[PDB]
């Protein structure tokens, strides 16, 4: 049914441009630099410990022909080499500023970082006054403010893009950026940074080092998500006033000292993972409020990695308000869940109809899909990539799955989704490396195996119809692929080395899908769909977090070029509030399957706290809270550190 | 000069026996079971998280024909599968008892472990009363006493080899064995085991659970090396009376709370690694005494992994009293050191003469050899195996090296040694997997690369002359190799899967080197050598730790079959004591290069402690202590927990 297009092999072979770099010692990196420019950097990095100094000139290449023809520019990288952990630090989006943190063969004063500002078309060298411990970090408000960490725990900042390097503090553990060039960092005061792990001091500077202000003492670490600011004392504190107020988080249970973990922090609320007594590897997800202080139960049996803390929690970026994670069950098996109201109510993933298990083993109960993510990756399962979802391409999600078999754990297979996670379908066999470009118009996949591959699998209709193309007759060992950074982008680049019967030489392939996408998608090529509605009312067919939006979708076998935004509703319409448009309240949880939020097995009734006590005004109510960000009206009536 | 033997390709091809297992889902394991029997087990294991229960029948194969012909015995492993972390637990040496810790597809009561006692020729099934968290541990005094850890932190013991399973304690964190069926284990008392990490209680039972005795409280963890017993409070305690006395270790420096790490514990002394202030990744090695209480400085700049604690410390098992580790230097480069008096005096590795750097770059100072070990492996360097040394084959050490270049860090190359580490020589290019058999008479190596290999490299004269053999025309992706477990053993087994243009099917190759080793090594094929002497006196040419022993060595191009012990001195002769026959004393260190132990920069003079104070009798002396185990006489005159 998927058919084909105007015989595509000729159009791809004309657009598949190969360049060979021959012998390149070390691991080869590759990255595009901006769109509508055709600049590709090829840097060789060495996995060398940071403490040791040694010789070696890392090679560097640059193509200004959209990857059609490269040019050796190692002349710049003379007597210098870049480590693998360092790599290439690419500027954010249209900044076009790349820095290469290198080290001299025998240099001792500091590293020789190479800076460019015109999308890596020409560089300017400079010598750091220190040996950098971490790669340069960018500032959000301006890309010309650089953060660095010295080997002697020295914090340096650059106001003029590597020009001047002033030091901020000499006893800095870790440091991050904040809203509008705000720099947060912890500080030790006795020998080693890691020696004072149980008690540090978190500072903050609003003027890039000139004004300091101690914001927190006796701390494990700190974080920064959304508009929030966190600090771990175990105990945890949430801050909104940039650290001026650290009201502790209050939770229903936590009998002893349950360990906490911030899953993800939206600009509205923040997810937190709290463990269970006796470890055992499961916990519960707590959903906060508009301030991130009071938390409500959201999900049980939440699996996490016992050694690390990673979990299958995934933010479906395609659809707003959809998240996916894996949990245990009554039969102690692996099952993944999904929510459509941002942690309000979770539900089981409906098994894919066009997949092979409902007819394979119906007598056996367990064969639900398991979307692999960071929990499976942390457990060293054969999972190359986490679920992928681009916000421009709404609904589109691609990930690795499993059907509750030991073979599917070793071989996950690749699943697709256009409903934003509500419905799935197995499309590819085995592990793959996939990428999304053209705002979902193209989805390229590459097989992950021990055998040298030479085939690329792509789909031009949002993963509905997959085509197979052999980009070369010399099978390469896959090293990686890169996408051109554009909303309308259509070139990609695959690179790897060939087995040439000794003397393995590298080679990069750059493919352009323009001649494939001849036709422009007319209105005859689209279909209109609505997000899944967990509400039974007919006048609420897609009110994700309050409002209803209509989206469009390329039809099957669509080999055309899209240029429209996948959301057709310019100004969305607000629906009346629903039961799923409301989050559970404190001390209340929504049991499995059912949709009515009931009381947690308690009767005494509590009333939170506020850091050093000073409790609430006691709001009883039932167990429903307006979801932070859910814009609806009517429908259902609701009831420390110095 | 190395020549060849009576055209060996025919003798190997007749002894190279191949068997194909076809499609085997999961990772394939293989292991011999005793010598002079020809039993090989081939088990497929799955890398599945322990918490989840799922379906799957793991396949099992057994060959009773020395690997010439296998036989499918999956009939036993019915509705059961073995995880990768579990694998096959092989009995110690001539016990011939193998257990396969499996799990039922839907079983919940406990695992179905399969036990055998006649070298895996026939098994007996049994159902565990619990889900095992760890693989069975063997007891030293008797192989029929099994230790296990339940998923609910339950400690179980088996008196009759899986027959009866009695529980010992319900709140057990970790547990190990001890001298004569003694079981040591820590215990928690508040919710989780890991929640009470700062304070546990270490118990001990001498009668397999009937009599308990609390031996230590407020503990991080515990260890057991040699005849010693350790407990971490940071602080560390050393015990000899099986835990009845925990006299704290005293060290010269340690200004604040330097972190400690026990490197290796001999039956005489014990090495300890103590970190430096500010981390930075280097520390000092401390050598203890005959009791392991008072420690002396031994080496500076000792590199360790900052995230984990691994270090290049290696026990050269071939020569008694030789150890190797890597340290920093004045030029902040990587250099490995070696001692011949068991931590008494370290010296730089003399650069290999027949290697390419002394003529490549003499103007540049740094190009010493760097023997890779656990420090490089922990840093994820391309190092497959640590240094290998079998005690039967004296002098023989094989390891991966480096010459202080970024390329040599990515590609280590394989170095050999017959002087026990004093002299080295590069023999093979690139990373390899190597093994030793025939008590050093055969040394097999296999190339480690991304390309499917079909060539085996071996040497029949203690790594002096290497030969190359192509064991098949179907290149396989190397999975692993196994050696027959015998002092006179001569079969090996290599297994892996072939790229068959999809449907990769497995295949195992078993090679016998008997027809290669026709001749028996007469006295015309040996040479006599003595261990390196760090002493200038001529009448002490090889007095390692006191006594002098004469060893023998197969000459170059020796293609014969040895049957003699490589140490010819039946009763060794005691040398008079030397300066290297004495260890530095407390508060004294031996500086670099020179051999005179001098004072640590201190003048006040201290006098140790004894747990709750009660200090010493103040023995001043200079800075020399008799090495624990060094048997010499004359020559040089020398001067907590409840
Ligand atoms: C799952 O993934 C989705 C992505 O689809 C995430 O949603 C994104 O959330 C981020 C924020 O977390 C959005 O990014 C930007 O947030 C800015 C907030 O910064 C302001 O903070 C304080 C608030 O008082 C201000 O005082 C301060 O001055 C900062 O300005 C917004 O300001 C941004 O708005 C921007 O929009 C226009 C668009 O062109 C810009 O030009 C403006 O300059 C303006 O700054 C923006 O909202 C991001 O937009 C969200 N994505 C989408 C698609 O909505 C979810 O957060 C994530 N889930 C979780 C749990 O993390
Ligand atoms: C570097 O590597 C070398 C290996 O070459 C290590 O040397 C080995 O050390 C181990 C011990 O650590 C030796 O193994 C055995 O140790 C036993 C000690 O157990 C006794 O402990 C107390 C002591 O009072 C006794 O009361 C108790 O009852 C135990 O018996 C010895 O007893 C062993 O002797 C055995 O020898 C014969 C040989 O046939 C046996 O049949 C006997 O049953 C007897 O038990 C043995 O010594 C091992 O032998 C050492 N190897 C060599 C080649 O000497 C180094 O320790 C290691 N370096 C470091 C730092 O760990
Ligand atoms: C995918 O790759 C192709 C080529 O590999 C890119 O097409 C190239 O786009 C550039 C930019 O427009 C073209 O250069 C232009 O040439 C004209 C005429 O010489 C000149 O007037 C412009 O100033 C500009 O230099 C280039 O000719 C063109 N090459 C081909 C073969 O079409 C394409 O842009 C890439 N895809 C994306 C999304 O960028
Ligand atoms: C390396 O492998 C070879 C074969 O792959 C092993 O040789 C085999 O050794 C066994 C044990 O002695 C021999 O079996 C014996 O056969 C005789 C006569 O039938 C019988 O009387 C004995 O009771 C015993 O069963 C077997 O014939 C022999 N095979 C060959 C081809 O020689 C060899 O032992 C292996 N190496 C080592 C070190 O074990
Ligand atoms: C760049 O590379 C060149 C050659 O590879 C280096 O030039 C040599 O430098 C040394 C000492 O720096 C001089 O003694 C030689 O005379 C130079 N060669 C020539 C032909 O003049 C140069 O050092 C490298 N750049 C840096 C910064 O080290
Ligand atoms: C061993 O394997 C056999 C077949 O693969 C299993 O036999 C079946 O068991 C189920 C329930 O246990 C019965 O309903 C079937 O009738 C059995 N098959 C036949 C042909 O009789 C057997 O269960 C497996 N062993 C275990 C312990 O599960």
From Swiss-Prot, chains A, B:
One annotated Gene Ontology cellular component of this protein: Golgi cisterna membrane
Disulfide bonds: 2-465, 173-193, 357-367, 521-560, 543-575, 577-632, 584-597, 611-640
Record carries keyword Signal: yes
Protein's GO biological process: D-glucose import; endocytosis; endosome to lysosome transport; endosome transport via multivesicular body sorting pathway; extrinsic apoptotic signaling pathway via death domain receptors; G protein-coupled receptor signaling pathway; Golgi to endosome transport; Golgi to lysosome transport
Extracellular side: 1-642
PTM text: The N-terminal propeptide is cleaved by furin and possibly other homologous proteases. Palmitoylated. Undergoes cysteine S-palmitoylation which promotes the partitioning of the receptor into an endosomal membrane subdomain where it can interact with the retromer cargo-selective complex which mediates its retrograde trafficking to the Golgi apparatus.
Highest taxon, organism lineage: Eukaryota
Induction of expression: During osteoblast differentiation.
Entry protein name: Sortilin
Organism (species): Homo sapiens
Gene: SORT1
């Amino acid at each position: 049914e998927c058919g084909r297009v105007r015989d595509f092999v000729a159009k791809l072979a004309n657009n598949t441009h190969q360049h060979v770099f021959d012998d390149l010692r070390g691991s080869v990196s590759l990255s595009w630099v901006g769109d509508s420019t055709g600049v590709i950097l090829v840097l060789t990095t060495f996995h060398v410990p940071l403490v040791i100094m040694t010789f070696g000139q890392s090679k560097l290449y640059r193509s200004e022909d959209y990857g059609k023809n490269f040019k050796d520019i190692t002349d710049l990288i003379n007597n210098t080499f870049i480590r693998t952990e360092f790599g290439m630090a690419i500027g954010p989006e249209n900044s076009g500023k790349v820095v290469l943190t290198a080290e001299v063969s025998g240099g001792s004063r500091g590293g020789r970082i190479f800076r460019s500002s015109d999308f890596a078309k020409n560089f300017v060298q400079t010598d750091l006054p220190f040996h950098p411990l971490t790669q340069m970090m960018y500032s959000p408000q301006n890309s010309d403010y650089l953060l660095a960490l010295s080997t002697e725990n020295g914090l340096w900042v650059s106001k003029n893009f590597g020009g001047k390097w002033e030091e901020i503090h000499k006893a800095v553990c870790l440091a991050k950026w904040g809203s509008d060039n705000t720099i947060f960092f912890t500080t030790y005061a006795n020998g080693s940074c890691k020696a004072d792990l149980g008690a540090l001091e978190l500072w903050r500077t609003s003027d890039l080092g000139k004004s300091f202000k101690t914001i927190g003492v006796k701390i494990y670490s700190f974080g920064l998500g959304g508009r929030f600011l966190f600090a771990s004392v175990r105990r945890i504190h949430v801050s909104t006033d940039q650290g001026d107020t650290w009201s502790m988080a209050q939770l229903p249970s936590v009998g002893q000292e349950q360990f906490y973990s911030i899953l993800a922090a939206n600009d509205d609320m923040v997810f937190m993972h709290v463990d269970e007594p006796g470890d055992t590897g499961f916990g519960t997800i707590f959903t906060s409020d508009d301030r991130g202080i009071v938390y409500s139960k959201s999900l049980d049996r939440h699996l996490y990695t016992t050694t690390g803390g990673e979990t299958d929690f995934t933010n479906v970026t395609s659809l707003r308000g959809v998240y996916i994670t894996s949990v245990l069950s009554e039969d102690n098996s692996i099952q993944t869940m999904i929510t459509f109201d941002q942690g309000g109510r979770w539900t089981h993933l409906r098994k894919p109809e066009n997949s092979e298990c409902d007819a394979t083993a119906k007598n056996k109960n367990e064969c639900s899909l398991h979307i692999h993510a960071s929990y499976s990756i942390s457990q060293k399962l054969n999972v190359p990539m986490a679920p992928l979802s681009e916000p421009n391409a709404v609904g589109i999600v691609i990930a690795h799955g499993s059907v509750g078999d030991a073979i599917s754990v070793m071989v996950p297979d690749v699943y697709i989704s256009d409903d934003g996670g509500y419905s799935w379908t197995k499309m590819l066999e085995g592990p793959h490396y996939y990428t999304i470009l053209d705002s979902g118009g193209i989805i390229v996949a590459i097989e992950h195996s021990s055998r040298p591959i030479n085939v690329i699998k792509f789909s031009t209709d949002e993963g509905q119809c997959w085509q197979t193309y052999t980009f070369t007759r010399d099978p390469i060992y896959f090293t990686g692929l890169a996408s051109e950074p554009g909303a309308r982008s259509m070139n990609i680049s695959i690179w790897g080395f060939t087995e040439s019967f000794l003397t393995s030489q590298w080679v990069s392939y750059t493919i352009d899908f323009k001649d494939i996408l001849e036709r422009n998608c007319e209105e005859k090529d689209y279909t209109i769909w609505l997000a899944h509605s967990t509400d039974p009312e007919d006048y609420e067919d897609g009110c994700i977090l309050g409002y209803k939006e209509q989206f469009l979708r390329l039809r099957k076998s669509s080999m055309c070029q899209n240029g429209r935004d996948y959301v057709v509703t310019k100004q969305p319409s607000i629906c009346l509030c629903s039961l799923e448009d409301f989050l559970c309240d404190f001390g209340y949880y929504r049991p499995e399957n059912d949709s009515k939020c009931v009381e947690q097995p308690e009767l005494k009734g509590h009333d939170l706290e506020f850091c050093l006590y000073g409790r609430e005004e006691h709001l009883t109510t039932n167990g429903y809270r307006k979801i932070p960000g859910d814009k609806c009206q009517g429908g259902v009536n609701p009831v420390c550190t110095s």
